[PDB]
């Protein structure tokens, strides 16, 4: 099968600026009939891929002019001259001059914004969960940019390395920041064997991590 290679993998672009996505194919895309079937799709979070550009440079109905494509043979390029929040999602270049038709790995387009430190919130296990015999300590890191961030859990001053699940939201359209959850799931017996519960977030916005904590002996 013909392989399509897209670059970069991720693409941070300030609002109003231009973005370029490259796509190369393992073999020539000019069909014997003379056409070059290289297209560009955009898949917004949770939605199906939506066509932006077909046959190297033609715009699909409804697609605004700030979107344009170029290239030839095996080298192609998608351009987005006035990036907007709505362009948030993943772009895929596609090829169908050869069978089967194939897609590039994709390019995640990220909106650049001023760096923002997360707001951290910590939550002890709830009485209902304790009653079930379990205990989850939850920590929320909201509204931070960039996405890179490290969270360390400390029980009675000691770093906890397992039993932790993390989940991140995608970039917020009207906000351009990210949020995430860090959950430490222990057994009730384990939870009651300790006092201090600490959530530590380290983000470029500071050298000193953000620290949220509570002592079981005091809530």
């Amino acid at each position: 099968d013909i392989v399509m290679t897209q670059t970069p993998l991720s693409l941070p672009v300030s609002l109003g600026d231009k973005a370029s996505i490259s796509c190369r194919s393992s073999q020539a895309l000019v069909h014997s009939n003379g056409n070059t079937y290289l297209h560009w799709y955009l898949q917004k979070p949770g939605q199906s891929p939506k066509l932006l550009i077909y046959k190297v440079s033609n715009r699909f109905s409804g697609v605004p002019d700030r979107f344009s494509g170029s290239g030839s043979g095996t080298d192609f390029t998608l351009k987005i001259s006035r990036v907007e929040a709505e362009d948030l999602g993943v772009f895929f270049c596609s090829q169908s001059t050869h069978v089967p038709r194939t897609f590039g790995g994709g390019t995640k387009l990220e909106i650049k914004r001023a760096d923002a430190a997360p707001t951290v919130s910590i939550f002890p296990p709830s009485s209902e969960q304790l009653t079930s015999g379990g205990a989850s300590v939850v920590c929320f890191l909201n509204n931070f940019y960039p996405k890179d961030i490290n969270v360390k859990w400390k029980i009675d001053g000691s770093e906890r390395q397992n039993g932790v699940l993390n989940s991140w939201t995608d970039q917020d359209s009207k906000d351009s920041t990210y949020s995430m959850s860090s959950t430490l799931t222990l057994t009730k017996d384990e939870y009651e064997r300790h006092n201090s519960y600490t959530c530590e977030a380290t983000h470029k916005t500071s050298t000193s991590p953000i620290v949220k904590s509570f002592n079981r002996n005091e809530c």
Binding site: S48, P49, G105, W168, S181
Partner: protein
């Protein structure tokens, strides 16, 4: 308006088979090839094959020749894909679509909403919903954050809501994650500190698979 409606979320067991449908409307169902594309929750798109309803002819990429079987019923303008001997590798959303760029005046490129297929041996399980109130004394900021922990449910989705939907702003429901073979998820909500607790904040969790609907008021302390 060209429409491709796919059948809903299906649960399947290892080794079983599943069949999904795709209804077309707004164009000659018999004129364009109907394609099936696979998308692993993490990766890209992969063409499985296609069927020309005009005469029910099919074409498959080698890899899927024995995995899927494409079918159509011109009668109801409906296409069907059947995947056999399911493995965890078959879990993904599958899309059906129409794609043709060589008809001058009208370019065809439309996709269905996609059908989620989850292969697993976990048993259907209603979720446990736990209210997350602020830790003691945490009430000095201009705002305050509350949470809702949904744990131990299968399969997905789950519909998490704050105040029956009236509260949508300042919220973040994170993507579900696997704990054992069950899913767990969470949502945080931030409101003006003077708001809560005087004015109630309730987390509503619906799990269609288990036909459950739960409301869990965030009580302080």
């Amino acid at each position: 308006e060209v429409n491709l409606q796919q059948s809903g979320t299906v649960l399947a067991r290892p080794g079983a088979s599943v069949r999904m449908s795709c209804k077309a409307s707004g164009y000659s169902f018999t004129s364009y090839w109907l394609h099936w594309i696979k998308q692993r929750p993490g990766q890209g798109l992969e063409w499985i094959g296609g069927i020309y309803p005009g005469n029910r002819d099919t074409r498959y990429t080698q890899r899927f020749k024995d995995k899927a079987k494409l079918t159509a019923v011109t009668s109801a303008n409906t296409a069907y894909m059947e995947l056999s001997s399911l493995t965890n590798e078959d879990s993904a959303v599958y899309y059906c679509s129409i794609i043709y760029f060589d008809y001058a005046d009208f370019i065809m490129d439309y996709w269905g909403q996609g059908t989620t297929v989850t292969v697993s041996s976990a048993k259907t399980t209603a979720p446990s919903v736990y209210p997350l109130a602020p830790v003691c004394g945490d009430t000095t900021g201009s705002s305050v954050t509350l949470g809702c922990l949904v744990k131990g449910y299968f399969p997905e989705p789950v519909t998490l809501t704050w105040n029956s939907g009236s509260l949508s702003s300042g919220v973040h429901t994170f993507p579900a994650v696997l704990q054992s073979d069950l899913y767990t998820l969470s949502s945080s909500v931030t409101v003006t500190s003077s708001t809560w607790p005087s004015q109630s904040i309730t987390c509503n969790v619906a799990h269609p698979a288990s036909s459950t609907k739960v409301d869990k008021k965030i009580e302080p302390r």
